[PDB]
Scaffold this active site. Structure first.
Site, PDB file in Angstrom:
ATOM      1  N   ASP A 194      -2.828  -1.819  10.213  1.00  0.00           N
ATOM      2  CA  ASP A 194      -2.202  -1.932   8.604  1.00  0.00           C
ATOM      3  C   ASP A 194      -2.751  -2.868   8.489  1.00  0.00           C
ATOM      4  O   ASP A 194      -3.700  -2.826   7.279  1.00  0.00           O
ATOM      5  CB  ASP A 194      -1.009  -1.523   8.019  1.00  0.00           C
ATOM      6  CG  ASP A 194      -1.236   0.140   8.398  1.00  0.00           C
ATOM      7  OD1 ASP A 194      -1.188   1.027   8.622  1.00  0.00           O
ATOM      8  OD2 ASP A 194       0.664   0.629   8.540  1.00  0.00           O
TER       9      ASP A 194
ATOM     10  N   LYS B 107       0.693  -1.219   0.114  1.00  0.00           N
ATOM     11  CA  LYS B 107      -0.590  -0.357  -0.084  1.00  0.00           C
ATOM     12  C   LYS B 107       0.995   1.353   0.333  1.00  0.00           C
ATOM     13  O   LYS B 107       1.997   1.419   0.511  1.00  0.00           O
ATOM     14  CB  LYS B 107      -1.235  -0.069   1.070  1.00  0.00           C
ATOM     15  CG  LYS B 107      -0.203  -0.562   2.616  1.00  0.00           C
ATOM     16  CD  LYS B 107       0.506   1.241   2.942  1.00  0.00           C
ATOM     17  CE  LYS B 107       0.521   1.311   4.138  1.00  0.00           C
ATOM     18  NZ  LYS B 107       1.440   2.254   4.782  1.00  0.00           N
TER      19      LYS B 107
END
Ligand SMILES: Nc1ccn([C@@H]2O[C@@H](CNC(=O)CCc3nc4ccccc4[nH]3)[C@@H](O)[C@H]2O)c(=O)n1
Ligand SMILES: [Br-]
Ligand SMILES: [Br-]
Ligand SMILES: [Br-]
Ligand SMILES: [Br-]
Length: 269
Positions: free
Chosen positions: A131, A10
């Site tokens: 995350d 990401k």
């Protein structure tokens, strides 16, 4: 009966810190973007093993931590040998390890007749990395809370994105620990910013953890200044080390990278 699973990276398209939490952690607002940049994970039936091509000890590997907790919570004994080819460097602000955890534990859960619900899997991975839950959905999502409270969105952002990853490994904890009162914003300010970025206003991206990472790790700042010299606006993913920009890599950047040990990753959103 070996299978391969891709574990994507990401970037944060902006990040804001709202303040401190009692738990030591911080409440944040961020826009997660899945990028076409992967570790490849080979899963095989056998003695519980988690290995990488870059020498992360098994006991320290988030995937191994997650699979042990899987066993613990669910009762079932996990018989899978995991090898991860790490293209996503640790400490790069790209969530490589959190991605590894989410995708492996989602796969192993499915392979074992789905003992855990998507709610419970979310809780399992989320407890190890804030995350990690993002990687259970992917695409684009607003991250609230510590990052685990997620809202999927559609962005107007497409085209070239280039990552420039220096060889320095940024400690997320050391960056968050250097935070002062002046670094915090109101959630209203940040929510307005996120809306604009979602609508394609990339100029609106900012990230105080990047500001700090550039001071703590001067090489992150060297990459940042080099991207400016190249004529692009640089941005920092996570707490660093990755600097990204919306454009292609010239031969001069590729040369600088090869000489300096930077990794250049040219992607298309
Ligand atoms: N929403 C969040 C998410 C994370 N954090 C901070 O970063 C987390 C990640 N840190 C760790 O797991 C241990 C410290 C650490 N992180 C590292 C990353 C790379 C290299 C070495 C590291 N040591 C917590 O420590 C917490 O202080 C936080 O304050 N708020
Ligand atoms: Br403070
Ligand atoms: Br450095
Ligand atoms: Br400077
Ligand atoms: Br930024």
């Amino acid at each position: 009966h070996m299978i391969k699973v891709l574990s994507p990276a990401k970037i944060n398209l902006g990040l804001w810190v709202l303040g401190r939490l009692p738990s030591g952690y911080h409440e944040i607002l961020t826009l997660y973007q899945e990028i076409p940049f992967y570790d490849e994970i080979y899963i095989r039936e056998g003695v519980l093993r988690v290995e990488t091509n870059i020498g992360i000890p098994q006991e320290e590997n988030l995937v191994y931590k997650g699979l042990r907790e899987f066993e613990r919570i669910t009762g079932i004994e996990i018989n899978y040998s995991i090898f991860i080819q790490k293209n996503i460097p640790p400490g790069a602000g790209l969530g490589g390890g959190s991605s590894n955890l989410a995708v492996v534990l989602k796969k192993v859960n499915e392979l074992l007749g789905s003992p855990l619900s998507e709610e419970e899997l979310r809780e399992l991975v989320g407890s190890i990395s804030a995350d990690a839950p993002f990687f259970l959905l992917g695409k684009s999502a607003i991250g609230r809370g510590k990052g685990e409270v997620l809202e999927p969105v559609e962005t107007e952002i497409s085209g070239k994105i280039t990552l420039v990853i220096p060889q320095v490994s940024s400690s997320t904890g050391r960056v968050y620990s250097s935070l002062r009162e002046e670094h915090f914003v109101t959630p209203e300010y940040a929510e307005e910013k996120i809306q604009r970025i979602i609508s394609g206003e990339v100029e609106e991206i900012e990230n105080v953890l990047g500001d700090i990472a550039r001071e703590l790790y001067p090489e992150i700042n060297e990459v940042y200044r080099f991207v400016e010299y190249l004529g692009f606006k640089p941005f920092v993913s996570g707490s660093g080390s990755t600097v990204y920009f919306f454009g292609g890599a010239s031969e001069e950047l590729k040369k600088a990278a090869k000489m300096r040990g930077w990794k250049v990753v040219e992607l298309e959103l």
